[PDB]
Amino acid sequence: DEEFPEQKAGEVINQPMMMAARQLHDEARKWSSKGNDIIAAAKRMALLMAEMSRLVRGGSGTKRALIQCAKDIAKASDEVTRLAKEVAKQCTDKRIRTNLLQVCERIPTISTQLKILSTVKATMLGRTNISDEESEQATEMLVHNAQNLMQSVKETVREAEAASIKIRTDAGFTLRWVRKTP
């Protein structure tokens, strides 16, 4: 749906993470979710990554929240991977089928690490008895993990769509790629 507004004060958020979210948002946005669960799930991930970019800046109730957020994102990526392998299975182009499988057999890994990292950062949130360098590094591991995940899924969207035009005749599974424009 709706475009992603720009930044401000504001806006305590972690920018690289909001950026990553925005990159995914912008790709998925162009598409209808009707008949396409990868798109539906991608949209949820980007919005969740946006929330993450706030939570990670610390605050009231952010620990429990940030841990669940990572879990929500992790669950959504599973659907993207699961659905993205069904597409690869039905695709007749080796190049695409291969990029598709590759770019998505890493997703679950990035996701698990996201939970682990979110939780570390979640435990640090508040405690001033934690070295600045230990938290900053925690944040950095998480930001970098978030970026891979956002990118990885964006690429899965783009490859899946590519495969749509290179699917076997009378396929048992297809995703609908219909624009959400003018």
């Binding site: 709706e2 507004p5 919005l47 929240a65």
Partner: protein, 279 residues
């Protein structure tokens, strides 16, 4: 002025000023759905619900302020799917102040005046605590900001009886029953070319003294048949206007009305100069 009418008026105005039934929920999960918010607020009557998914906030209009209060108390600092929600009254969007109304315009005539531009959320004239008489201004809030733009536009410079209305946005800066009462006054009906700020300002001190007082000088650099005054309290302005209005000065009887509360002398003067400017 009866005291059963005074009280009923003042009473109505309060009910209006306090029927703040618009709430804001922040902290929602990134993947929250409207169904989720509607569920959360199922014991309440939702008149309107919009979820800003990118912000994790939900703008919700409940039946009335009593329900708003109950939602706020009940859910502020609650948890939804492990998230901590902040529940609180939405900020002021479309809140206009229509001033220079005829002092006799009723509350019903005011609603009639201001109601066409969209659905009103709150609408009230501002009366004197003692006399119970309209101070010549009121406040209109709409469900949509679009509505307030339409209104300001159609009402600024509108003739209503012997008056030309003035409209001014409340940004909003937030008001209390205290700020509802203006500290500024406008003097017009001044003699042609008249130049007695010293005399004019002298006249206006017969009760309390103006912290502000100036003539309307244009960027022509003409003189606009009016002046603007400020007083330390809304009470000092009140008494000043009561005594000053009608007074002879120059060959003429001065008209003395309140300015919309908010802006200080400096600003109102420009504001009025510029408004009447767009003639």
């Amino acid at each position: 002025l009866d005291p059963e009418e005074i009280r009923k008026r003042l009473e109505h105005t309060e009910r209006q000023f306090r029927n703040r039934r618009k709430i804001l929920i922040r902290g929602l999960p990134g993947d929250v759905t409207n169904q989720e918010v509607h569920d959360l607020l199922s014991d309440y009557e939702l008149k309107y619900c919009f979820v800003d998914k990118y912000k994790g906030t939900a703008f919700v209009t409940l039946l009335n302020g009593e329900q708003a209060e109950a939602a706020i108390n009940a859910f502020h600092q609650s948890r939804l799917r492990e998230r901590e929600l902040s529940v609180q009254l939405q900020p002021t969007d479309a809140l206009l102040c229509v001033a220079n109304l005829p002092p006799s315009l009723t509350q019903q005539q005011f609603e009639e005046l201001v109601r066409p531009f969209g659905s009103l959320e709150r609408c009230f004239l501002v009366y004197s605590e003692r006399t119970g008489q309209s101070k010549g201004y009121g406040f209109a809030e709409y469900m949509k900001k679009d509505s307030a733009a339409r209104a300001k536009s159609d009402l600024l410079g509108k003739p209503l009886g012997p008056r030309t209305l003035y409209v001014h946005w409340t940004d909003a800066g937030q008001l209390t029953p205290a700020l509802l009462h203006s500290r500024c006054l406008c003097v017009d009906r001044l003699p042609p070319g008249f130049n007695d700020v010293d005399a004019l300002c002298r006249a206006l001190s017969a009760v309390h003294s103006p912290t502000f007082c100036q003539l309307a000088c244009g960027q022509d650099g003409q003189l606009k048949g009016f002046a603007v005054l400020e007083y330390e309290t809304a009470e000092m302005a009140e008494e000043a206007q009561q005594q000053a209005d009608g007074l002879s000065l120059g060959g003429s009887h001065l008209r003395v009305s309140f300015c919309a509360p908010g802006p200080p002398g400096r600003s109102m003067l420009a504001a009025l100069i510029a408004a009447q400017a767009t003639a």
